[PDB]
Design a protein around this ligand. Structure first.
Ligand code: ZN
Ligand code: ZN
Lengths: 127, 214, 100, 24, 199, 96, 91
RNA sequence: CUUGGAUUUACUGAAGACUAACUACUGCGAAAGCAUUUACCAAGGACGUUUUCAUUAAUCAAGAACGAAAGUUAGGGGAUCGAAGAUGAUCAGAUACCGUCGUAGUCUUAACCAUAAACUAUGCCGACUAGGGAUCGGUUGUUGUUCUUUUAUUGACGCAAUCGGCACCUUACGAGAAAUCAAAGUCUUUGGGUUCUGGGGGGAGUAUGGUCGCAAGGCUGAAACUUAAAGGAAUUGACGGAAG
């Protein structure tokens, strides 16, 4: 029926990676980040640049034959935050509005089963 | 300068007959050249696919299956069972407060020499007439529930082949029997096989794999 | 003087509780002292449900939720207004605020 | 000063006195 | 004498003629007089038995391991030393093992090893405390003690000799491509100074 | 458990301690049970069993050594083996 | 009378070699001169010969062991590790 | 750090730590502390007891055991964090806060160390004084409950009692300078037993002596001189780069 790809979205608090792969994920089709769309470091994770990255990969998907995508949304994970960054919401929305078809949605944030000593120290970062 | 998508060739992924929707989808790889073949570079790949996609029924939506390709037949790929997993939201939805989480694992090999780790998870069930806030089982009780799970997972996996086990894992054959056995010790809810892991595989038998593909 | 009878934590009949790192700043805080919040949110904003449903290849697909248990220290929570300073009498009220 | 730092300051001074007495 | 590891005399029967064949093994810690030692492919996994590396499960502690099939013992022979079997490649008939220095090596699974730890461990924990103890230690090994520092010699005797103050003068890290008479000091040293952190 | 039964036998019934006493008891047919310590040499142990097999006498293998078997009997010396000649108030014979 | 407060067997070295080197020797030298309990005959008559040689005066059994103790800590780990590995292979 | 392919992607593999969610005004322990599974080894509290001995007891100078973290000694490990150090910012200056690395250390085995806001800032044993609802373990009687299995001798749930605990809510007969306290009550209506500590603030836990420790230091521990205050709880105002 449709041509299922896999859109693996990385939504941190400093950047947003929109990475469209095959079902295995061993083959990369498109990968455009927030910093490829803006010239300032501060708005690389901004939802504005997130849709721009999401629109470019969507155009990349059609021209190679991709018609539908599975969504692998995740945060930084590990010992760091588990909530997705701001760029994940607008990029997926733009992917929905870019003519692509959406399949499954799942959050694949890597979660430790305990963990290593998280950076910052005992007293954390004091601002 | 090279447009690297001109030299990709599309292939077809096929699920075994134990699964219903055998048309998984399509993959891509560089064309086969004299130096490196496309066939050897395409086998061994792992595909994570939802069980609702392999069965059609949306009841199986929260379990995703890994499929490992080990044979190539022209444009089609002959895959095999590689593992089982729960969706992250589902396993997080199961773990509520004021209830006891009991989880057991065991490493066991099948009749056809497929060494597996089967992960079972169960929770205490709140009675309809219960008044108290929490539903906790005693530590001695969860040990017996854990003891019952392991001796059943060993009994159901080591007594059947890998292909027959796939016929059990889909309809929760192991999960329902654990609930019956652990019933007299403590009422349980949401007894599941949340993870299956392949560790060691036997000597390759593409004939038996061909027997799993029609 | 003693501002709280519970001493700002929940350790009674206990010697030591293993500390946790603040989500905001990774500061070590005792587990029974940390401000903990259960968070079950949608993947998409409520406006983004119309355009996701139409693009779905599955008929009547339920959107999975975003489950999290957040941890804060006293400084993390107050600055983010997770908790607010209460009067001397209203400090004793430990029933949850009525919001939902 | 801070009480902790005054205790630490005296320890450095106390060790100076011990080292001086070691010469004789 | 000259060896920290004790030796065990083990008597076998000769398979082909009426004779006793006497072997000198390196004694593993826990081996006693009158103990039966089994050597071969079908020998059980017991301390002191000689087994091919392929017949030992992963994590087995072995000693006097062969580098090549039939060289009669090459690795892990000093007191307190042993070899850990990391993994197997039955398809290639190879075995990954860990050497006392920390090196990982690939050996044929036909190579043999003796199960256990070489006896006499902890010998270095006690100080010698005396020049006489070192004298007696090297009296049964070779003539290498005592050692005069090259920097304390004259320029004829050593590259480091000479000068109005005892000093090397030039970098003591010497190239690997240097010739005999130059290789005095730290040969082909990748780094120098106190070892800080992991290696 | 067998430690308790044996201790009562020493206090109540008749027994002999030692390899020489035990073999004489087996020869005379007076032995009801022969208990052997763990660290007894196999050659002597395999000889005690042959005597016991000929006399048709049960054998119990004490799990501790001659030091532990000795102190179970209330002795301040090591007992490598013993033969219970007359089980008294205890019931050590019925269980082995 | 307690003849030495702390040096013990290292009182033969007088005032030489440094306190740390002598107290490092004392820990090891007491172990190497002690009598140990024989695992074969059960008597406490096991004495060191050379390094790694531990003979029993009673039963004439010689066992290979540590340089200064009958058994090193590492060897005891191997006996247990080998034992469990042997069990799995032999079921 | 990156066209010498950085970041990202999937598979594989190894190293060490650590046991997320479950996780609580919940449990165990003399305290410090204790959270993957199973096995082994030896302990312990509570409850049950128409079992057993008969005062064997409480608190304790002197003297012992254990004692977070950091630190010391010698091996092994050193993934991540990270004192020191170096570096990029900010700043008048920052050798600080923020960012990037990073050595000891974090881990472990043999030993030392004996200190913490080691706090419940509340010594231990004992008896009494007010109501209430929860909760854990044991025990004792009873279900429109659910379940083994079809039911009982199942289990869970429910309702009642109790002993023990961790505690919580209201009131203040009573106490207190007050905050507050079911003990901080039964204290000028002053006495159940007992151990320890304090005599205005500094100087000062300093000097010296002694003693223990490898050291770092621990314990014991002044005086000269100096000062009319220092401090506790609460009130009004003022202020706040705190909230509403
Ligand atoms: Zn903070
Ligand atoms: Zn002996």
């Amino acid at each position: 029926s449709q041509v299922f790809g896999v859109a693996r979205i990385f939504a941190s608090f400093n950047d947003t990676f929109v990475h469209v792969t095959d079902l295995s994920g061993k083959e990369t089709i498109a990968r455009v980040t927030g910093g490829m769309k803006v010239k300032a470091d501060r708005d690389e994770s901004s939802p504005y640049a997130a849709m721009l990255a999401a629109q470019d990969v969507a155009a990349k998907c059609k021209e190679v034959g991709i018609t539908a995508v599975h969504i692998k949304l995740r945060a930084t994970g590990g010992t760091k935050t588990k909530t997705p960054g701001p760029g994940g919401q607008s990029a997926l929305r733009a992917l929905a509005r870019s003519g692509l078809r959406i399949g499954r949605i799942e959050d694949v944030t890597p979660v430790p089963s305990x963990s290593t000593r998280r950076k910052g120290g005992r007293r954390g970062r004091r601002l | 300068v090279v447009d690297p998508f001109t030299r990709k060739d599309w292939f077809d992924i096929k699920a075994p007959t134990t699964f219903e929707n055998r048309n998984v989808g399509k993959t891509l790889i560089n064309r086969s050249t004299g130096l490196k073949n496309a066939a050897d570079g395409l086998k061994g790949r792992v595909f994570e696919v939802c069980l609702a996609d392999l069965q059609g029924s949306e009841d199986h939506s929260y379990r995703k299956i890994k499929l490992r390709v080990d044979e190539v037949q022209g444009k089609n790929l002959l895959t095999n069972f590689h593992g089982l997993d729960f969706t992250s939201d589902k396993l997080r939805s199961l773990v509520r407060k004021w209830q006891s989480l009991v989880e057991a694992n065991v490493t066991v090999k099948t009749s056809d020499d497929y060494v597996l780790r089967v992960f079972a998870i169960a929770f205490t069930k709140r009675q309809p007439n219960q008044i108290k806030k929490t539903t906790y089982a005693q530590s001695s009780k969860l040990r017996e529930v854990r003891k019952k799970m392991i001796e059943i997972m060993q009994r159901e996996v080591s007594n059947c082949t890998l292909a027959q086990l796939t016929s059990k894992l889909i309809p929760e054959v192991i999960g329902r029997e654990i609930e019956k056995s652990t019933q007299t010790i403590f009422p349980l809810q949401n007894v599941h096989i949340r993870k299956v892991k392949l560790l060691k595989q036997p000597k390759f038998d593409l004939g038996s794999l061909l027997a799993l593909h029609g | 003087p003693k501002k709280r009878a519970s001493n700002g934590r929940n350790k009674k009949g206990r010697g030591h509780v293993k500390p946790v790192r603040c989500l905001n700043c990774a500061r070590c805080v005792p587990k029974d002292k940390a401000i903990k919040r259960v968070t079950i949110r949608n993947m998409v904003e409520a406006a983004a449900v119309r355009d996701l449903s139409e693009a779905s290849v599955y008929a009547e697909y339920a959107l999975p939720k975003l489950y999290n248990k957040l941890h804060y220290c006293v400084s993390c929570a107050i600055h983010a207004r997770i908790v607010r300073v209460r009067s001397r009498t209203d400090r004793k009220i430990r029933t949850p605020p009525q919001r939902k | 000063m801070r009480d902790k730092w005054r205790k630490k300051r005296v320890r450095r001074l106390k060790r100076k006195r011990r080292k001086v007495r070691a010469r004789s | 004498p000259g060896r920290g590891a004790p030796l065990a005399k083990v008597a076998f029967r000769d398979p082909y003629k009426y004779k006793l064949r006497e072997e000198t093994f390196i004694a593993n810690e826990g081996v006693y007089t009158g103990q039966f030692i089994y050597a071969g492919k079908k020998a059980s996994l017991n301390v002191g038995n000689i087994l091919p590396l392929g017949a030992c499960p992963e994590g087995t502690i072995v000693s006097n391991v062969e580098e090549k099939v039939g060289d009669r013992g090459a690795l892990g022979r000093t007191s307190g030393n042993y070899v850990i079997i990391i993994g197997h490649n039955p398809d290639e008939n190879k075995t990954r093992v860990k050497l006392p220095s920390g090196a990982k090596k690939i050996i044929s699974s036909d190579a043999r090893g003796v199960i256990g730890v070489v006896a006499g461990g902890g010998r270095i924990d006690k100080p010698l405390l005396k020049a006489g103890r070192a004298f007696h230690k090297y009296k049964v090994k070779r003539n290498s003690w005592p050692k005069t520092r090259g920097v304390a010699m004259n320029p004829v005797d050593h590259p480091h000799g000479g000068g109005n103050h005892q000093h090397i003068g030039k970098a003591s890290t010497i190239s690997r491509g240097a010739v005999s008479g130059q290789k005095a000091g730290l040969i082909a040293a990748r780094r120098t100074g106190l070892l800080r952190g992991t290696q | 458990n067998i430690n308790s039964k044996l201790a009562l036998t020493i206090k109540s019934g008749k027994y002999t301690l030692g390899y020489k006493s035990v073999v004489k008891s087996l020869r005379t047919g007076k032995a009801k049970l022969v208990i052997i310590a763990a660290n007894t040499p196999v050659l002597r142990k395999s000889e005690l069993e042959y005597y016991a097999m000929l006399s048709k006498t049960p054998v119990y293998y004490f799990q501790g050594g001659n030091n532990e078997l000795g102190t179970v009997c209330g002795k301040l010396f090591r007992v490598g083996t013993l033969s219970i000649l007359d089980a008294g108030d205890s019931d050590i014979l019925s269980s082995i | 009378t307690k003849r030495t407060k702390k040096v013990g067997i290292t009182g033969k070295f007088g005032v030489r070699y440094g306190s740390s080197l002598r107290r490092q020797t004392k820990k090891l030298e007491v172990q190497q001169h002690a009598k140990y309990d024989c695992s074969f005959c059960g008597k406490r008559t096991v004495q060191r010969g050379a390094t790694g040689i531990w003979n029993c005066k009673s039963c004439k059994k010689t066992v290979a062991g540590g340089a200064y103790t009958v058994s090193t800590a590492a060897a005891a780990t191997v006996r247990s590790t080998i034992r469990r590995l042997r069990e799995l292979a032999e079921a």
